[PDB]
């Protein structure tokens, strides 16, 4: 009942038969920008189904020595489908996100992944006073990897990361995690190419292990923008 779920947006749908309810970040739900909070005065474009749909990124392999993975939003999708086109042709964007992380194995496998959506995850660099560079931050669809997941690569800690919207994928329990993210920013809209509102982090707190037949165990991420709005139309960047 709270273990099965179907998500449908646009021409895309996803089902899971081993869910663990699902998370609504801070108890909120995505919505379009109301007139009393608006700033940009040009009429926005709300493409709906062409952008508010699931985009599945390339999978990653969960290995015995993996440290974890991360994908920044909207960066990870800024070059995918019609969402990517609207982002490139407009100075301003706004949207929520429906995140679905997938990972199945066997009744003989064990492992636990923390799936957390971090707002404003400003990364820190290790053992240097030099700030992270553009290429250390903007990885796009490929996403990045954690150097020191123990401190969330920002000098804090993964132990307290549960203060952020999250779920876990504990192999003996479930095979997917779902998190609904509302627009999260101090401004009603933003320039999509230089600021990432959220960072999706998937970290193996309990390593993958088994004594049965060894198989490649992938982790897949599907993300659907929600209530997309774009302002400041011009040429593509």
């Amino acid at each position: 009942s709270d273990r099965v779920l179907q998500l449908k947006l646009g021409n895309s749908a996803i089902v899971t038969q081993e869910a663990a309810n699902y998370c609504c970040a801070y108890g909120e739900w995505p919505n379009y920008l109301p007139d009393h909070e608006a700033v940009a005065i040009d009429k926005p474009t709300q493409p709906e189904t062409s952008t508010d749909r699931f985009y599945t990124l390339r999978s990653v392999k969960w290995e015995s020595n993996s440290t974890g993975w991360w994908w920044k939003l909207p960066d990870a999708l800024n070059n995918i489908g019609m969402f990517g086109q609207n982002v490139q042709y407009h100075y301003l964007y706004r949207s929520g996100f429906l995140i679905h992380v997938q990972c199945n194995a066997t009744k003989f496998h064990q492992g636990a992944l923390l799936v957390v959506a971090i707002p404003e995850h400003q990364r820190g660099a290790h053992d240097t006073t030099t700030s992270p560079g553009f290429n250390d931050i903007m990885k796009g669809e490929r996403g990045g990897t954690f150097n020191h997941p123990y401190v969330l690569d920002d000098g804090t800690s993964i132990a307290c990361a549960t203060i952020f919207p999250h779920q876990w994928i504990n192999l003996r329990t479930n095979n997917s995690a779902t998190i609904v993210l509302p627009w999260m920013n101090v401004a009603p809209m933003d320039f999509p190419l230089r600021h990432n509102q959220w960072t999706l982090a998937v970290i193996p707190v309990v390593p993958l292990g088994t004594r049965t037949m060894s198989s490649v165990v992938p982790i897949t991420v599907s993300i659907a923008p929600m209530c997309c709005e774009f302002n400041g139309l011009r040429h593509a960047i």
């Binding site: 100075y91 809209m189 400041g232």
Partner: protein, 247 residues
């Protein structure tokens, strides 16, 4: 008496404080008020008046030549005529305007701007131009096919001599600000470019080089915040006669 205690801040002189103070001349009767034309109560009233942009701010252009942009009959199509940097908080064609000068007494701004161009060629001269406003993000467009994708107005020369290009307030944040970095995401407004839509066409006896005068002003959805000393005036010495005021 009343028991009291002094708080931090006591005795200080804050130039922006607001208190009453001892009248130097008790029982003084100020001159009666008289109606005088042109009273202004909010500086926003002043910046809504359009003033001339110094678009031709180039070496070789002297004085008033800098206040007009000359356009000539072209031999090629879709020609770029000129562009205009838009930070009303930095030096450029927009700095010495009513909106620019007053805005520079502040740090934050928000609102739509309007650029009006008046064609000053002869009556027998005709033409169509396209004025484009490109929101920020990339490099300034250099071709009409690219500029045309932004906010724009196609202008046809005729009896009504002027056209207005509205630069709508399009910003992620409520306000934009000055911080001396023109490429900052909270400062850059984008670009304005002008191309021939068709061409300037004139008969043999009309001048084949005509001028445009560009004006700019704020609309009534404008707002300015955080007053600061203006960078447009300064002194390194006493002005002549200043010391004589003591003699």
């Amino acid at each position: 008496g009343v028991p009291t205690y002094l708080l931090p801040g006591s005795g200080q002189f804050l130039t922006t404080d607001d208190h009453s103070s001892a009248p130097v001349l008790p029982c003084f009767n100020p001159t009666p008020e008289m109606h005088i034309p042109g009273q202004i109560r909010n500086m926003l009233e002043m910046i809504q008046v359009e003033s001339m942009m110094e678009i031709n701010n180039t070496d070789g252009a002297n004085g008033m030549e800098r206040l007009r942009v000359d356009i000539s009959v072209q031999a090629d199509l879709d020609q770029l005529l000129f562009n205009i940097p838009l930070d009303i908080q930095l030096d450029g064609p927009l700095r010495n305007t009513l909106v620019g000068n007053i805005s520079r007494y502040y740090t934050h701004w928000s609102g739509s701007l309007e650029m009006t161009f008046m064609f000053c060629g002869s009556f027998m001269a005709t033409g169509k131009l396209i004025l484009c406003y490109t929101p920020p993000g990339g490099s300034c467009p250099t071709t009409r096919e690219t500029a045309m994708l932004g906010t724009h107005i196609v202008w046809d020369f005729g009896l009504q001599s002027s056209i207005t290009l509205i630069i709508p307030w399009i910003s992620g944040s409520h306000y934009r600000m000055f911080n001396s970095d023109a490429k900052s995401t909270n400062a850059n407004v984008g670009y304005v470019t002008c191309f021939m839509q068709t061409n300037l066409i004139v008969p043999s006896e009309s001048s084949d080089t005509c001028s445009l005068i560009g004006f700019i002003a704020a609309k009534d959805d404008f707002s300015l915040r955080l007053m600061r000393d203006s960078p447009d005036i300064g002194q390194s010495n006493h002005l002549h006669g200043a010391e004589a005021a003591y003699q």
